[PDB]
Amino acid sequence: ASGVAVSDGVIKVFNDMKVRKSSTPEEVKKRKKAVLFCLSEDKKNIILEEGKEILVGDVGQTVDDPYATFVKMLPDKDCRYALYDATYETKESKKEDLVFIFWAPESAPLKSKMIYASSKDAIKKKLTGIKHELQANCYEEVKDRCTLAEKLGGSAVISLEGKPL
Amino acid sequence: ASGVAVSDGVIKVFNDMKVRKSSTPEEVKKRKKAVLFCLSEDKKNIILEEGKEILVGDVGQTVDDPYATFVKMLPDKDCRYALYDATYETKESKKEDLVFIFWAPESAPLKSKMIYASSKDAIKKKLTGIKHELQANCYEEVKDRCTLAEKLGGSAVISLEGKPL
Amino acid sequence: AALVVDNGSGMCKAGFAGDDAPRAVFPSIVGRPRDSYVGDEAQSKRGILTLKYPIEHGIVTNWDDMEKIWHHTFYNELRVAPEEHPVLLTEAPLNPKANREKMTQIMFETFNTPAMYVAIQAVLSLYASGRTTGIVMDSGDGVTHTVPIYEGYALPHAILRLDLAGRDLTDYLMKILTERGYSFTTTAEREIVRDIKEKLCYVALDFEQEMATAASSSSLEKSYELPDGQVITIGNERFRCPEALFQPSFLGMESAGIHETTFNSIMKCDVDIRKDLYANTVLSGGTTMYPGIADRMQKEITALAPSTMKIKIIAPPERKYSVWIGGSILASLSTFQQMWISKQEYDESGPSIVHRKCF
Amino acid sequence: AALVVDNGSGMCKAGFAGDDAPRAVFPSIVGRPRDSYVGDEAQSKRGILTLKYPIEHGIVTNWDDMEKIWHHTFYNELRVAPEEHPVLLTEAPLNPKANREKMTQIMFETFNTPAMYVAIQAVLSLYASGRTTGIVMDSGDGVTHTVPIYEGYALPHAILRLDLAGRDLTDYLMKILTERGYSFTTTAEREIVRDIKEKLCYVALDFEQEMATAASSSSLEKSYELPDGQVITIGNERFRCPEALFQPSFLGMESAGIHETTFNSIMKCDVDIRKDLYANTVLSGGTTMYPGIADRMQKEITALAPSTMKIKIIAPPERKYSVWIGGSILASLSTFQQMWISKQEYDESGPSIVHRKCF
Amino acid sequence: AALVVDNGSGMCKAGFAGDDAPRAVFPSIVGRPRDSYVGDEAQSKRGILTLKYPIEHGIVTNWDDMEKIWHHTFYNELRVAPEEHPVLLTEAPLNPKANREKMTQIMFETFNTPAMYVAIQAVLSLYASGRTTGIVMDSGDGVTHTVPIYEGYALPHAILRLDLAGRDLTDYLMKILTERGYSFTTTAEREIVRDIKEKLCYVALDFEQEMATAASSSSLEKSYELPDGQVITIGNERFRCPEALFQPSFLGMESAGIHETTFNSIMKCDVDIRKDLYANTVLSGGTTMYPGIADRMQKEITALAPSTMKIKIIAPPERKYSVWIGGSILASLSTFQQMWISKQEYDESGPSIVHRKCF
């Protein structure tokens, strides 16, 4: 418990991402498919990383595989919090669930890893309703699509983002 | 199942106690109100304990409460089988039923408790027609008239041996 | 010392002539493994065995199981030898003549009773109320009968039989108690529900008004303690269970209620005697012991009968065992000793003697 | 875009009208520390908290916990606002009329749903099979129901409820797996055993013949891999666990099997319609997904029914979610939009509107 | 002269029928180098080998090691030839029928016993207390069982098994003694800790009140002398080690305590017999020998059971070996000689003879 708080911008973004409201298709394209959270300059709040996000409307036009490009947004030598809206299909249902991803690469500095790890249990308690968590400590543990599928439903998952595994 | 058999004397006594035959009042006074059964010296048969019985003719002349004096016949540190002819009255009937009583006090030696308990299901099978069974393991569980009344008909019993509870 | 045995559909009442109450009242069931248990012994094993009713609807259907009940009655319940006491038997209305002879044959050949007699259950109930003319609404365990009687003789063409009695009400109470979250399914739990029914159920004078009262307060709720100490609460089920007597549609039955069955049997009699039957309606049986059943029957029959008719429902306080009590008093009379069918008479006329000696 | 919620005894099926499969299928439990967790969150904590079933046997007993499940359904599982979508709810057979009004009141006042509807689970399963007359054997998680339906209306007097379903089979499989040396006692290990049951268990056509086969060879043995990598072997337990459905005595229950319960409910219907019910027996629920259960039910019912009756057991391949799939198609029809209970209608008639709009 | 062998989970009790106490009590362990040592021999070499429990949880899992224990029992402990004496074996509750036949086959073919018999451990404990109906809380070394018995027959559907017994308490005392600076890790030091547990541990009536008492003074501290002469002091660990029986969360277990397990097994029985089970709770096994365990169990069960039930915990002073003493008296009876399974009978009916002769 490092005492790092969660900014109101992150809470507002998460609430918009969780519950889908009836809106025009123009507003549906503005929904966030993925988003990254980072520490502030003073390291006192968890804030939104500007420009590091994926919109639903971008999927299928500029983005082919939303998960592949989301991984590219993860810094190589820095820790980050991620919120991915995973669309997958099991053997008897088509699911759409939010995934909380803790990106703590080994190449990251020790100061970044300590603060992010010690404040992870505080931000996740504010983001109520998330049932999937992915802790990745290297690029090989997050770049593979089957790694996310195993965390979602194990071997029951037969498709991810509309593409078979 | 200890293999202990039931002597023909016990079977004859039980048969006389169960079915009442038309007899002169002199023979009615010779009917058994209560009787105790014990193991033989060789512990191979269940026999009648000589002298430990209550006659119907003794009730009202020498015996005031047939149940109170029957309990006094139970040994303090020994197990015993008992056959009590309970006369009780419910809210809508006057009943006369045989009660099989297993007396196994905690103060009895373990050898007596083990043999009597393991051979109880064998003697009770020979005494067909008994619908009430009282298992008493201490003096407090058999000396109370209300304990027998609860086993007979629960709260429906309003009188026992001609005396209200 | 004569024996009086009331062979009811679900309960057997037995005792000695001259006593105020029967000595033994046990279920008339024979249990065999899913080797033969009769009465309370069959219910003590609970679910290991299957239960059969030989006299399920007042009429004996299995005579082999009936002898087991009679043998259990004499030796285990009454604890007497049947060959030393005359036995007075009771029969349901509309009992076939073959069953009367079969009952007589069993008593004299299997049990060797010195004397024997058969009486109609409805007639004994009417006599016990001090009447020779009237209609008896006998609601027992497995069957309900409305028997109009004129001058001590039942009118067979007007007798109506209803297969709706306390046995169906016990099952209905189990079904509606599950709506409160309780679960009574086993044989042991059925006896608990029957105890609840006999202690907390009552007939509502106005069912719809009573339903609104129970839904607006908790003054009609009662607490019952289970044998293991748990306490359950019963509310509107107290008057909903006996309401199936007047509204058989609650059980999915197309038949009419006990009030309409009584009215229909009266209308099947002669017009000149219907006035007497309206004012001499006598209730009998255990299923008629719900508080408020006489007032409800009076109100329901009044709405059916013409307004000029005087409706009087007779509910004696001891109507639960009026069949047995009437038989016990009759069999204890010194003048009744010449009404018995002796073994000597049976040896000459055979089982057919019962038709001319007991009608 | 309407919402279809199937409130099962142990699992809640939710989704959007028009979809082939429910979007969310989660356990219907509420967990509190030994401060409130619903669904998979209650199972993720495992043993720290205690689990309660508010709809344990198809009938909602705790309405406070039921609202928590509904709130978790709309916001966490379906991820939609309930005030923007009409919601179609399903109810168990023999659901009391008070519960229907309570369901309607909660939807309109707590969640402010624009429209609302109630459907019977058994009727939706029968319609999904292309039938309006027949008997549905719905075996779910906490309860098993045999619901005979005639022309789209369930016969309440013939509906039989059995407290024996997949929840009891999961516990029984845990008990009999300890005979092989394994130990499954914790909440986490119970979910492992449930996965084993849903993947390796099957119903044997002849139980005694199958037991001899498993005791003479190893062709019936299957291997299962635990989450931690350990591999266990299960032999005759594959067909012994679902055998408790047909032999409830394996669980210490006195009740009859699902085959006798189905036969008993048919025998409680009108004699003229029993022939149609014999040939229109439809299976529904997750507990009917065992391979070989349709053939076993056909063999068992045939031995009970008269030889002149044609016994046909219908086991559609999608019978696991037939209640939800039928509700989703019904709610997605443009002609069904007039059948919803609008909020305007609720404001005028109150919660009692559900009785005349949804029957 | 018959032989009585009590095959416990962690300790084997053996002796001759008619004796008051078993002749040999040795651990039921088979050890192999990290070539085969059984009993105290396996513990004498300490750490050079690895120890295995073939009957770890009352149910035999390794029959090859079980025969080694039996061979060590007859020849090294009892010092008799098994072919000259009948042997009475005891089995844990819920023992599979396959294990009973395997026990019979080994006794007659490997040891050539002239006669052989199987008895249930829980039933022998109940009989030794002079009861035929009751619930036995048998807490041994590797397993704890609550076995409700009605008229001498255990109810298998209500038997609950708890994997928490003296073996876990010895390990827990080993763990909590390190908080005082002591170090017990080796196999030899484990036996020292077990001796401390059997001599200085007791069950506190109020755990929280006792903890405050131990933290404010030193009246609860006791001194123990190690085999090498060193003296250690144990304070609050005396009542914390057996407290894990009532609070399994001390060991990281999600299971309920022995008081709740006893209550849960009673509630799985018929409602009509729960009153008898409450007043006939009998303690058995070595783990029930802690002073104050009967009073604590009485207090804990009373808080769970309804206030109208009479809770009586029976803790005979000789309950540690009540299974063996009950078997020795039964096997020494002259009337019991016809209950034995003779070798002649085994040669005709095979190993299946045990099912109809020993139930």
Ligand SMILES: Nc1ncnc2c1ncn2[C@@H]1O[C@H](COP(=O)(O)OP(=O)(O)O)[C@@H](O)[C@H]1O
């Ligand atoms: N006080 C009571 N209130 C309501 N029902 C009762 C009462 N006493 C008995 N019953 C019911 O009466 C039924 C049997 O009564 P009875 O007429 O003696 O049976 P039978 O049909 O054998 O004559 C039982 O099913 C029981 O439920």
Ligand SMILES: Nc1ncnc2c1ncn2[C@@H]1O[C@H](COP(=O)(O)OP(=O)(O)O)[C@@H](O)[C@H]1O
């Ligand atoms: N393939 C399968 N084979 C056997 N049992 C299954 C299968 N799938 C699900 N089940 C069982 O079905 C039960 C619940 O199914 P469902 O009918 O949805 O319950 P409910 O209707 O009560 O919510 C679960 O306990 C599960 O064990």
Ligand SMILES: Nc1ncnc2c1ncn2[C@@H]1O[C@H](COP(=O)(O)OP(=O)(O)O)[C@@H](O)[C@H]1O
């Ligand atoms: N006096 C005692 N106080 C507390 N625990 C004891 C005592 N005597 C033995 N034990 C414990 O009982 C356990 C084994 O007892 P027992 O019931 O004979 O085992 P099993 O029946 O499983 O072979 C041992 O682990 C030992 O720690």
Ligand SMILES: [Mg+2]
């Ligand atoms: Mg009658």
Ligand SMILES: [Mg+2]
């Ligand atoms: Mg369902």
Ligand SMILES: [Mg+2]
């Ligand atoms: Mg033991």
